[PDB]
Ligand binder design. Structure first.
Ligand SMILES: O=c1[nH]c(Oc2cnn(Cc3ccccc3)c2)nc2cnccc12
Ligand SMILES: [Mn+2]
Ligand code: NA
Ligand SMILES: [Zn+2]
Ligand SMILES: [Zn+2]
Length: 455
């Protein structure tokens, strides 16, 4: 009547044989879970990593949250310990419902959350912990050096599902990246309380994300499959246009809370789940998700990218360009980095990188033919990867340049990508200089190495 819960997302219970490699399993369930955007993974019953940290020595600065639907939100009172936050959180929920925290039905909290964010008369604010591990504060999973060690203990250190490991693993193409992308490579830690929420969003570069709830009360999720992404965006733009006025920066991205029933009304497929302690939630590329916490809990999450994602990664950078959105990293620079490490790549990875590189080269060849016909004649090799990101973003579309860019001595330090040659200045194109990383004759042997590796 007021809230009709979306259908449940897929729940997977793999045997230990299937649970062996995360990426093999993710590839296995992909045809199913990609249709819902999110899926839940219950590990085999005896897979129980030890959570152990001092509640008094762990301290963090909490972010404050107003609970209002369609109200804009962004990033950066009090400094909590994990204990003092927990005492505040437990007290809040206890007072809100006048009940012991574990007698409050999940269905009630869900219904109450959506009633709360709708009503203007209700001005409930909550606090949330959201930060990258930094030994301040460190990961909830076990990490190396300290304690010799036992078989079970040491297993959780090397496990694929240890979220400290999955970034630097072999099929996460993000691991080969040498540029600083700390926000996209290191696990995030979320300390939640009742009604603390995360707004509708997709990951940077449309990456996967995997989320683990270490302990505490459930985390309620809502998910939308990647194919219905622009459906959702169209729906939201008509209801809250102020969120789509393009941001000055990545730190100024606008997001919001929105009732899934509103989405379902406009025929956007939405799915839900209650993630309990010791369970994984996996989000797929361009899959919109949001949710809230049922109570005091502790979650850990990290982004990652499979070889399945490479074409989508390229598509995303193109999409960013049309939106004039900033990139976290250069997609092309990543490809060329892997190509240069062809002899030590996995052979299926090398096969997939070759395919994306083939597209990159052909697109680059066409672009350079176009700018040559515009009158750009002078050219000079340039090692784009040496420049800081802010020193190699296109003046027009803000894309991070790597393969090529146009410069002119009129405006030192400034660059445009080959799509925006007419956007640099008023000088004639013969005054311009084409700055390139590789000649086409350099690129084909690079791709050829990948071909040999893939045998
Ligand atoms: O469980 C999750 N919790 C969560 O917490 C939140 C809420 N806002 N933010 C974003 C944020 C980061 C840093 C400071 C302030 C805000 C993170 N954000 C998430 C994003 N994706 C998937 C799952 C989650
Ligand atoms: Mn997310
Ligand atoms: Na409200
Ligand atoms: Zn551009
Ligand atoms: Zn000029």
């Amino acid at each position: 009547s007021m809230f009709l819960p979306p259908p449940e997302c897929p729940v997977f219970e793999p045997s230990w044989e299937e649970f062996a490699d995360p990426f093999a399993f993710i590839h296995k369930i992909r045809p199913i879970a990609e249709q819902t955007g999110i899926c839940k993974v219950r590990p085999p019953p005896d897979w129980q990593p030890p959570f152990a940290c001092d509640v008094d020595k762990l301290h963090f600065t909490p972010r404050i949250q107003r609970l209002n639907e369609l109200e804009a939100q962004t990033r950066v009172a009090r400094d909590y310990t994990l204990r003092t936050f927990g005492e505040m959180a437990d007290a809040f929920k206890s007072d809100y419902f006048n009940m012991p925290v574990h007698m409050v039905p999940t269905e009630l909290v869900e219904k109450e959350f959506w009633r709360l964010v709708s009503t203007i008369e209700e001005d409930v604010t909550v606090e949330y912990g959201a930060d990258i591990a930094s030994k301040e504060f460190g990961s909830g999973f076990p990490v190396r050096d300290g304690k010799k060690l036992s078989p079970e203990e040491e297993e959780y250190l090397d496990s694929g599902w240890n979220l400290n490991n999955m970034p630097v693993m072999e099929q996460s193409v993000l691991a080969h990246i040498t540029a600083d992308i700390c926000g996209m490579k290191l696990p995030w830690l979320y300390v939640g309380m009742c009604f603390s929420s995360f707004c509708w969003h997709i990951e940077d570069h449309w990456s996967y994300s995997i989320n683990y709830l270490h302990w505490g009360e459930p985390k309620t999720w809502y998910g939308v499959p990647g194919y219905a992404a622009e459906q959702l965006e169209n729906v939201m733009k008509k209801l809250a246009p102020e969120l789509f006025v393009s941001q000055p920066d990545l730190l100024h991205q606008l997001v919001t809370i929105m009732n899934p029933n509103t989405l379902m009304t406009h025929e956007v497929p939405v799915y839900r789940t209650n993630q309990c302690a010791g369970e994984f939630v996996i989000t797929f590329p361009r899959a919109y998700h949001s949710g809230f916490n049922q109570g005091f809990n502790f979650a850990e999450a990290v982004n990652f990218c499979t070889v399945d994602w490479l074409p989508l990664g390229r598509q995303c950078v193109e999409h960013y360009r049309l939106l004039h959105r900033y990139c976290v990293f250069s997609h092309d620079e990543m490809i060329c980095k892997m190509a240069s490490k062809a002899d030590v790549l996995d052979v299926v990875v090398a096969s997939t990188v070759q395919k994306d590189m083939a597209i990159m080269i052909e697109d680059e060849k066409a672009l350079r033919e176009t700018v040559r016909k515009l009158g750009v004649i002078d050219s000079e090799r340039m090692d784009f990867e040496l420049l800081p990101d802010d020193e190699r973003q296109c003046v027009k579309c803000k894309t991070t340049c790597f393969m090529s860019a146009i410069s002119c001595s009129c405006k030192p330090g400034l660059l445009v990508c080959l799509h925006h040659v007419k956007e640099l200045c008023s000088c004639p194109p013969y005054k311009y200089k084409l700055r390139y990383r590789y000649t086409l004759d350099d690129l084909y042997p690079m791709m050829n190495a990948l071909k040999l590796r893939a045998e």
